[PDB]
């Protein structure tokens, strides 16, 4: 697979492509070198480093604003910035008492804000122009991952917390869900129905297991299921952690990346494994899609899965781009 | 605080489909000593203590 030119110097933790409101395609990446980077992707795959910004702590999550003019960052320095791209100016819009793990843009018919999930056990909402959060919500534990598709939001916490929020008029809790996985939550992604409305989410743990959960299925005992993944195998089977999960925006099928250095494509309706790649020299840390699903990006970096004894600061961190949306087409 | 204890993949059992298999778990937070923190938390602490 084709590399991205001038990749960061440390491990990558998040990826995010540009919205459809922008011409062309653009990729954002956050690394543990406290830097945020941008690449203009050509139709031929050639990547052009466009800009860069820096935090005082490792960047954990990134996202775009709806109109394509801003890029939001979440760092371990307990803050979060807004990055105007035409002027290349980054100011602070968010403050926390602990590292910020998740960041999302919420485009409601009646408001628009930035959501920040942090390890200080809270969930704040910012209007990008005032220093006070317009709303603060309480989490029962540290925030590990999240996702936002109006009018639905899902947040996974430590101690296997799982909360679903409604966003109409103003955000608030909808229901706290007993987790269908019995290990540490890690990544989550929301999928929609045939009428383009959010209906459920996909939860991934560190135990090579991903759960499919619908909000209101007719028969949840048979509709909601859990499946194994990212396990390399008479002999013991190595169980690796799921580090990221994202859905194809056109075909409704999903992809998964794990500590096994592989990425797999899945169909949850037919309940089938579409593809599984080769074993990269190091685990795959993050992934995402572009706006029309024709570009699948995934980053090859260390994930601290085996501790600090296995961190090699000289192994090259790569970002790969795969122009295969038809590998995710169902039959 | 930090990955000061050496990694040791915990052992387990499971079935696969139709037989009985054994499992090694290749995640440091699957051990009892790190079950209360995440990977990013442990990694962040090893950085601030200059244990890279």
């Amino acid at each position: 697979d084709i590399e991205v030119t001038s990749s960061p110097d440390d491990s990558i933790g998040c990826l995010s492509f540009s919205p459809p409101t922008l011409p062309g395609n653009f990729l954002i990446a956050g690394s543990w070198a406290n830097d945020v980077r941008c690449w203009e992707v050509q139709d031929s795959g050639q990547t052009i480093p466009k800009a860069q910004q820096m935090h005082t702590g490792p960047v954990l999550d990134v996202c775009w604003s709806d109109d394509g003019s801003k890029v939001f960052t979440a760092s371990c320095d307990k803050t979060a910035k807004m990055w105007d791209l035409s002027s290349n100016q980054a100011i602070q819009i968010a403050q926390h008492d602990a590292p910020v793990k998740t960041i999302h843009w919420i485009k409601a018919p009646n408001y628009s804000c930035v959501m920040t999930g942090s390890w200080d056990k809270t969930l704040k909402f910012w209007d990008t122009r005032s220093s006070n959060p317009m709303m603060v919500l309480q989490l029962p534990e540290r925030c590990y991952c999240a996702d936002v598709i109006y009018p639905m939001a899902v947040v996974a916490t430590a101690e296997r917390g799982l909360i679903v929020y409604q966003l109409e008029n103003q955000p608030s809790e909808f229901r706290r869900i007993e987790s269908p996985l019995k290990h540490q939550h890690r990544c989550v992604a929301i999928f929609k129905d045939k009428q383009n409305k959010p209906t459920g989410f996909a939860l991934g743990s560190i135990e090579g297991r991903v759960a499919i959960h619908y909000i209101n299925p007719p028969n949840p005992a048979k509709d909601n299921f859990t499946f194994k993944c990212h396990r390399s195998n008479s002999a013991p089977q190595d169980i690796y952690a799921v580090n990221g999960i994202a859905f194809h925006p056109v075909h409704g099928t999903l992809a998964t990346v794990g500590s096994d250095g592989r990425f797999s494509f899945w169909d949850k309706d037919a309940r089938t494994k579409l593809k599984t790649s080769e074993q990269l020299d190091q685990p795959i840390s993050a992934c995402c899609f572009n706006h029309n699903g024709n570009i699948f990006a995934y980053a090859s970096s260390y994930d601290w899965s085996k501790g600090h004894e296995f961190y090699n600061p000289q192994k090259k961190n790569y970002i790969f781009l795969r122009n295969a949306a038809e590998e995710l087409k169902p039959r | 605080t930090g990955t000061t204890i050496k990694f040791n993949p915990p052992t387990g059992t499971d079935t696969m489909v139709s037989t009985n298999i054994s499992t090694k778990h290749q995640c440091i937070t699957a051990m009892k000593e790190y079950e209360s923190k995440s990977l990013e938390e442990l990694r962040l602490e090893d950085y601030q203590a200059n244990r890279k």
């Binding site: 194994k228 089938t272 599984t276 039959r331 | -």
Partner: peptide
């Protein structure tokens, strides 16, 4: 590679 059925619990 080719299509395989999911390993579901």
């Amino acid at each position: 590679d080719e299509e395989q059925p999911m390993e579901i619990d």
